[PDB]
Design a protein around this nucleic acid. Structure first.
Lengths: 1140, 402
DNA sequence: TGACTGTATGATGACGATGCTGAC
DNA sequence: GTCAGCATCGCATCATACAGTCA
């Protein structure tokens, strides 16, 4: 059967909802942004934005408004979801604890009813005494909003105007008054009703009916000192109150339809408009007073601000700062001048936020990191069309790289405080040391007085009370400054060697032989205190004093060889406190104890690179929450230092790591470097907050990237990318792309903006070909705005556009493959297309054209016309398999470099998605569901093995293995089909059975196999099998992986308990949220494990885990594990987190 | 005016048209102006492509209902090449009931007026399974599958027995039992979700059962024959009986019973044949016995959205014509019984199969072929919606493309 | 003695297959 | 003979008329 695992990798970046107000307090201004299932909250600051809480939901946010009931201390948030769960939320902070509290919830609806096309709309009214909802045509849902009902009972009432465009509640009215625009055969009109909850029905509104426009799409309720509503359609924006009416038709509008508004000044003096082309509009209403004072209106003004990202949401803040929420591109903080710049434009961009969606295509490619690479590339679409490169971990670059063999350790320092930083670097070879002064990028050696050459030290660097310390292997040394001499120098009785060390700013230990000897620092001398014996040879040491500097430590960290144990010690009394023996014969290396955000931590990191970690309390010095994790094999060293507003802890290995903390749990982010050994924190004034690497072969030095879990590089195209693939042998990408064009009236089209393609270094242009359009083509120029499709060749390193190929006039590029075929060693770029004409709704002609790339010229080879649109194509056993309209044709590539059609499959309505494994073929149809073909090595034809009988409108398709098939559907659902393993009859073995169902809440555009995670290196076998990634329309990236029957049943009951304590937000049941739900049916999930729910176990409190585990004996099997599972399941959930 | 300016858009992209017939065509205009003659090249270039609206959906810009409406014009187009008839299989004593196989796209079942059922599946060339009845009062009225295992089916016969019987012939108990003679039933429907059965008879009273026993129902649902009953797929909980009265009366079963008690009950002119709940469960397709086809909404069950006049009479020896929704789409399918008296666009008004849009009421397509002039009073699309099976007199017609 | 509802009878409209003649 | 043109037979509704109960 099928047991699957779904987990969110990269959260949706696309901004759905946006709303502003005072949700967290009154003194603060809040920004609330909705990203599909994510609610993110911010506080606006002085030239900045401060994030405070990030809560997810079991739903797609459809309505999101801030409103404050009379008398209510604050500000409540009404949220309505796509499945019609309604909730009123309130913000509460109790010291450290921040949770979102729901005042009232309920899934209002109609049990039956068709959801209107334009979507649902919710309005809460100025006085906050009801919530109006337009869920279905012909009815108007109104929710009486008093805290009671906490269950949100609502009643529907008859709406006889069956077709509403937009509706608003009115300001400054004696009674609750609705203002909507509906459409009937006489055109569309504005109309008002009084919504009386007495009688639970409408009453005659203050207005008679009007005949607005012919395309009015948005209504805005204008507040006082006025009332009534301004109606913005296209071509013309008009105002409407009882007696008065106002109307302007600025010609700067008809170019693009304006799609969003937002009130700037609370009085309703002026409003911000935004269109589909990212143009920003001011809208001013100038008021009037007769006599001493009255109130009236005198036309409008629009002044045209400038250009931003494509606004799906607009909201003003204060001091000319507007936040723009974009689904099709990056969201922006933007600043509004009173003075245009060179281009005109009062608009200037403050900050930009990365937005991945809509991801129309993605591909996993293994660049750079040679062995595995990890990178995931994807697409942005439109004017904000781009490639996004996504990779796990953090990277750094080497500015200066002088070769250097065989080091051990290295240290910074600065003698002069007046500059205030650390210079004159030092590194030690085997047996000796070398000093290197800093100036610019040049290092070398030079000579410094008093620095000891004949001996190697384990300590260096500047130290307090203006001095340097350097402790060698034969003795212990102290350094003076102004004269630069060696005041004080200390040896051990028998002239023995220094073995195990430690050291710190205000105190040091040096061990020698065994014991610790324990040193202490006085001004410019020593004066040691007491001595030590302990147990035999000691494995390394750390004094680090936990706190600001400090720099005196009441604490001493050490190790052992025989017993193998990182001890902690009191000072100067030592005395063993916590035992903790560790299994294995390996020995502990590189200890430390860190401090970050009040937390109290330590680390110990043995021979395997395996490393242990504790949560602690400094008071008793007692360790707890025992757990270790393992990485690589090579030794780790442990420094620790700062950078901006975080902290860092990081281990050094073949896979150089770093450990922080994120929302009060830890994080392990690797680094991309090959090999690290010794490396040291160097913050120079010619190198602010930087770092130096020492390597076995060279040094390194660089600046370090932004602080995240996932790194994202962005190359904007300024036009829509559609398909992508990788050409390893050309070290570059092929990107199907397009730009919009518009008529020049003088033949041609003269374009719109400089973008991608038009900036290529070489380029080429398609050449007819027959059609046949000849003998008076006879179309028109009508249906303005034209799309020109392109193929782009893009360097994998510089990401500069190498080559641009333009396709035929009126051609659509649909599919693209990179592959080689037959006994032909050349790797090709094959693109399938479709001709798209005004006169025709269904394409009847397309092309399968083959390209080969050599020295920026991009020559063409095949060029083969077909009757139909080639939707999908994919490499198939040295052959090209393609989908042309309703036909599935398999082409063969022959030695005369021509395309030859081997066989056909004619039984489809329209085949859009092709996936292949071995000889098997998975066909996705927009109409008649999924189909599994195979192939016949010596028959050629196409048998039809099995088919799913259940109709599904699919968005993307994929093969998990030989017998399981994954599909994505138009209602944000996932399903899996299987070929019946049971031979038996023919009937059952011709029926794929839907064994998996799961509501994703997102629209999946593309599936691809691959991962961004290294191999192991323990403890292979791996816990899950396979890894399928997917890109969505809202910019989310997820993962699908196979599971064993133990786990699916394990995590399934595990889900159910977790579904008892969460706490929900909105009180939405996880089962309901995950239930398969389309317009026709609602069915539970099954076959699918929500990984997000499982990994969200690590964040509850310890008595909560204990609340599930202590009875998670209610089921857990026998063999060597019971409640010991309580730290298995954390080690199982740790085992999850790492598959992505 | 607006329906021709509300069609090829469909909607997104909002750009293009918008002129509202050129900001009003001076009222039509009077005399010559277009009209529907040149409502031709407009609709000929309607939506621009699909492959670019699909991409607009792939970007999430275009709403789903926009797409599905421009996807059903991708349908209709192929439906205009449905014009050929792959197969036809007959038997004596005339066809009365029709049901598709819920799971399988190639099997269908037909009933007789003589008591004889056929389980016909294709792509097999194996011969259909059969059951032989009484050939007199063995008329089958309302034949439906068994939602559990398909190898069983429910049925309602004129012989007086609403039964559950295998296609292998052997009766698997009985649900309803007359005990007289002069009475029999005309309707039947079941449900997988709410686990029920239902049956309406010719006297106006109806029964409802679980798939196990349970006779919680017999109360008179009106005066004279109950021609048809249908359960709501998305509501379950809801029910609707259409019948001779000139009224459909609905119900929700459950609450409300005590005679003359029923939420809604909407009257008509003339007797009626069909209720037919929608795939979404909200609209009802009532289909009258003279012309006129009606559609109500879930918003106001009392008021119909609009009437579609369409010639389908009643006749003693012509199987009652019931119209039916299409799965997957908002389409309406019905056979035609041409009639000497009405308002008709297209002489000479042959017999054919008609298809309208449920949101408009306009005719989008018609299905006809000579060598088969018979009146098809049953058609009812398969659950995939890729084929049509008409019952036509002694014959069974399979509409596909190929 | 009002009501409601159920009994062997009749006019009737006009589809199918089945079948028989005469008249090409 | 294959094909044209009439009889002939295969419990649906709207309208009459008497009983039958039910209550």
């Amino acid at each position: 059967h099928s047991y699957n695992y779904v987990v969110t990798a990269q959260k949706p970046t696309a901004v759905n909802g946006c709303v502003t107000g005072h949700f967290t307090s009154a003194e603060d201004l809040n920004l609330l942004i909705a990203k599909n299932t994510r609610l993110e909250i911010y506080v606006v600051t002085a030239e900045g934005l401060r994030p405070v809480k990030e809560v997810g939901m079991y739903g797609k946010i459809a309505v999101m408004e801030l409103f404050r009931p009379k008398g209510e201390s604050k500000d409540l948030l009404f949220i309505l979801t796509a499945k019609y769960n309604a909730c009123i939320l309130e913000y509460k902070q109790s010291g450290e604890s921040i949770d979102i509290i729901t005042r009232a919830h309920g899934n209002v609806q109609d049990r039956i009813g068709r959801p209107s096309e334009t979507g649902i709309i919710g309005i809460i009214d100025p006085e906050c005494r009801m919530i109006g909802l337009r869920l279905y045509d012909g009815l108007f849902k109104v929710i009486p909003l008093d805290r009671d009902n906490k269950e949100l009972k609502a009643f529907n009432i008859r709406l006889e105007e069956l077709h509403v465009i937009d509706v608003k509640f009115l300001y400054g009215c004696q009674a609750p008054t609705i203002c909507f625009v509906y459409q009937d055969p006489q055109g569309r009109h504005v109309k008002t009703y009084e919504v009386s909850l007495r009688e639970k029905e409408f009453n005659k509104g203050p207005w008679k009916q009007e005949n607005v426009e012919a395309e009015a799409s948005m209504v805005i309720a204008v507040p006082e000192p006025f009332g009534g509503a301004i109606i913005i359609g296209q071509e013309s924006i008009t105002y409407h109150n009882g007696d008065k009416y106002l109307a302007i038709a600025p010609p700067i509008i008809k170019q693009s339809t304006i799609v969003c508004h937002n009130r700037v000044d609370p009085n309703g003096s002026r409003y911000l408009l935004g269109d589909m082309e990212g143009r920003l509009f001011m809208l001013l209403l100038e008021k009037e007073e007769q006599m001493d004072g009255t109130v009236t209106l005198k036309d409008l003004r629009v002044e045209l601000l400038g250009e931003t990202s494509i606004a799906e949401c607009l909201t003003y803040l204060d001091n000319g700062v507007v936040f723009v929420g974009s689904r099709l591109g990056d969201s922006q903080l933007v600043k509004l001048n009173v003075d245009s710049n060179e281009q005109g434009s009062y608009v200037v961009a403050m900050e930009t936020f990365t937005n991945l969606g809509p991801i129309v295509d993605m591909c996993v490619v293994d660049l750079e990191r040679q062995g595995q690479g990890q990178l995931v590339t994807c697409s942005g679409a439109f004017k904000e069309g781009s490639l996004r490169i996504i990779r796990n971990g953090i990277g750094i670059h080497e500015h200066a790289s002088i070769d250097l063999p065989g080091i051990k350790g290295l240290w910074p320092l600065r003698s002069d405080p007046n500059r205030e930083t650390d210079d004159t670097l030092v590194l030690s070879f085997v047996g000796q040391t070398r000093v290197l002064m800093l100036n610019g990028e040049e290092v070398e050696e030079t000579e410094l007085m008093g620095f000891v050459d004949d001996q190697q030290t384990f300590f260096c660097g500047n130290v307090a009370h203006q001095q340097l310390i350097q402790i060698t292997s034969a003795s212990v040394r102290l350094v003076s400054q102004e004269p630069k001499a060696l005041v004080s120098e200390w040896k051990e009785p028998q002239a023995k060697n220094i073995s195990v060390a430690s050291c710190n700013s205000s105190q040091v230990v040096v061990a020698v032989g065994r014991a610790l000897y324990y040193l202490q620092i006085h001004p410019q001398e020593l004066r040691q205190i007491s001595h030590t014996e302990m147990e035999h040879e000691v494995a390394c040491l750390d004094i680090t004093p936990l706190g600001d500097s400090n720099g005196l430590s009441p604490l001493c960290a050490i190790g052992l060889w025989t017993d193998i144990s990182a001890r902690i010690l009191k000072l100067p009394s030592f005395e063993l406190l916590h035992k903790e023996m560790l299994g294995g014969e390996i020995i502990p290396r590189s200890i430390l104890m860190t401090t970050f955000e009040s937390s109290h931590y330590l680390l110990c990191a043995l021979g395997d690179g395996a490393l242990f970690y504790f949560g602690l309390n400094i008071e008793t010095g007692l360790l707890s929450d025992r757990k270790k994790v393992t990485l690589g094999t090579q030794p780790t060293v442990l420094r620790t230092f700062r950078s901006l507003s975080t902290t860092n802890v990081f281990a050094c290995s073949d896979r150089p790591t770093v450990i922080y903390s994120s929302n009060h749990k830890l994080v392990f982010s690797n680094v991309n470097l090959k090999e690290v050994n010794y490396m040291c924190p160097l913050n120079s004034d010619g190198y602010p907050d930087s770092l130096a690497l020492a390597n076995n072969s060279t040094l390194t030095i660089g600046t370090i990237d932004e602080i995240q879990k996932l790194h994202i590089r962005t190359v904007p195209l300024y036009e829509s990318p559609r398909k992508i693939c990788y050409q390893e042998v050309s070290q570059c990408f092929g990107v199907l792309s397009s730009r919009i064009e518009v008529q020049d009236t003088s033949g041609g089209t003269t374009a719109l903006r400089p973008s991608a393609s038009t900036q290529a270094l070489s380029s080429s242009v398609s050449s007819s070909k027959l059609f046949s359009s000849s003998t008076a083509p006879h179309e028109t120029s009508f249906g303005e705005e034209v799309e020109v499709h392109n193929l782009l060749i893009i360097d994998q390193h510089t990401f500069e556009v190498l080559h641009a190929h333009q396709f035929l006039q009126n051609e659509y590029a649909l599919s693209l493959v990179s592959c080689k075929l037959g006994k032909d060693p050349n790797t090709y770029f094959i693109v399938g297309t479709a001709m798209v004409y005004p006169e025709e709704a269904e394409p009847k002609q397309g092309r399968i054209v083959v390209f080969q790339y050599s020295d920026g010229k991009l020559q063409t080879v095949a060029e083969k016309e077909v009757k139909g649109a080639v939707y999908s194509m994919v490499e198939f056993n040295g052959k090209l398999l393609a989908s042309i309209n309703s036909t599935v044709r398999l082409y063969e590539w022959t030695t005369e470099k021509e395309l030859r059609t081997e066989c056909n499959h004619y039984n489809n309505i329209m085949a859009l998605y092709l996936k292949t494994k071995g000889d098997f073929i998975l066909v996705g149809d927009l109409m008649r569901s999924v189909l599994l073909l195979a192939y016949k090595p010596m028959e050629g034809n196409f048998e039809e093995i099995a088919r799913d009988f259940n109709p599904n409108w699919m968005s993307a398709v994929e093969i998990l293995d030989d017998d399981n098939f994954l599909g994505a559907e138009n209602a944000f659902n996932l399903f899996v089909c299987q070929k019946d393993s049971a031979a038996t009859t023919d009937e059952e073995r011709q029926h794929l059975q839907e064994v998996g169902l799961f509501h994703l809440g997102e629209f999946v555009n593309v599936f691809c196999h691959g991962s961004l995670v290294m191999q192991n290196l323990g403890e292979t076998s791996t816990p899950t099998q396979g890894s399928v990634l997917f890109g969505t329309v809202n910019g989310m990236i997820g993962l699908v992986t196979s599971l064993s029957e133990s786990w699916y049943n394990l995590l399934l009951d595990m889900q159910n308990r977790l579904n008892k304590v969460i706490k929900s937000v909105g009180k939405i049941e996880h089962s309901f949220w995950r239930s398969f739900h389309t317009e026709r049916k609602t069915e539970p999930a099954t076959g699918f494990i929500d990984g997000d729910l499982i990994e969200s176990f690590l964040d509850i409190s310890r008595p909560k885990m204990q609340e599930v585990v202590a009875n998670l004996q209610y089921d857990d099997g026998s063999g060597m594990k019971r409640e010991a599972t309580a730290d298995d399941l954390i080690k199982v959930v740790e085992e999850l987190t790492r598959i992505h | 005016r607006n329906k021709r300016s509300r069609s090829p858009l469909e909607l997104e992209p909002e750009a293009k048209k918008l002129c509202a017939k050129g900001s009003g065509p001076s009222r039509r205009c009077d005399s010559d102006c277009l009209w529907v003659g040149l409502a031709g090249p407009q609709i000929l270039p309607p939506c621009r492509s699909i492959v670019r609206t699909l991409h607009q959906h792939k970007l999430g810009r275009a709403s789903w209902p926009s797409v599905q409406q421009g996807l059903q014009q991708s349908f209709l187009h192929t439906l205009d090449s449905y014009r050929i008839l792959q197969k036809a299989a007959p038997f004596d004593r005339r066809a009365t009931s029709l049901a598709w196989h819920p799971t399988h796209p190639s099997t269908v079942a037909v009933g007789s007026k003589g008591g004889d059922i056929m389980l016909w599946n294709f792509g097999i060339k194996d011969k259909p399974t059969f059951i032989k009845g009484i050939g007199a009062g063995g008329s089958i009225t309302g034949l439906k599958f068994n939602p559990l295992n398909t190898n069983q089916f429910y049925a309602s016969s004129m012989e007086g027995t609403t039964r559950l019987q295998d296609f292998k012939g052997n009766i698997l108990r009985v649900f309803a039992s007359s005990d007289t003679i002069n009475i029999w039933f005309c309707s039947l429907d079941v449900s997988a979700s709410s686990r029920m059965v239902v049956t309406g008879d010719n006297v106006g009273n109806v029964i409802l059962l679980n798939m196990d026993g349970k006779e919680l129902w017999n109360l008179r649902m009106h005066k004279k024959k109950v021609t048809h009953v249908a359960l709501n797929p998305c509501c379950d909980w809801f029910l609707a009986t259409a019948s001779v009265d000139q009224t459909v009366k609905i119900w929700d079963l459950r609450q409300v019973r005590g005679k003359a008690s029923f939420l809604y009950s909407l009257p008509h002119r003339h007797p009626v044949n069909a209720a037919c709940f929608s795939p979404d469960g909200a609209r009802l397709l009532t289909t009258d016995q003279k012309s006129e086809i009606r559609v109500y909404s879930a918003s106001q069950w009392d008021c119909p959205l609009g009437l579609i006049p369409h010639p389908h009479r009643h006749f003693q020896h012509l199987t009652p014509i019931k119209a039916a929704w299409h799965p997957r789409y908002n389409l309406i399918v019905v056979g035609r019984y041409p009639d000497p008296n009405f308002k008709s666009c297209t002489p000479y008004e042959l017999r054919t199969i008609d298809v309208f849009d449920g949101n408009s009421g306009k005719m989008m397509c018609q299905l006809y072929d000579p060598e088969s002039s018979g009146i098809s009073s049953l058609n009812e699309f398969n659950p995939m919606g890729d084929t049509l099976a008409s019952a036509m007199g002694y014959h069974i017609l399979i509409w596909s493309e190929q």
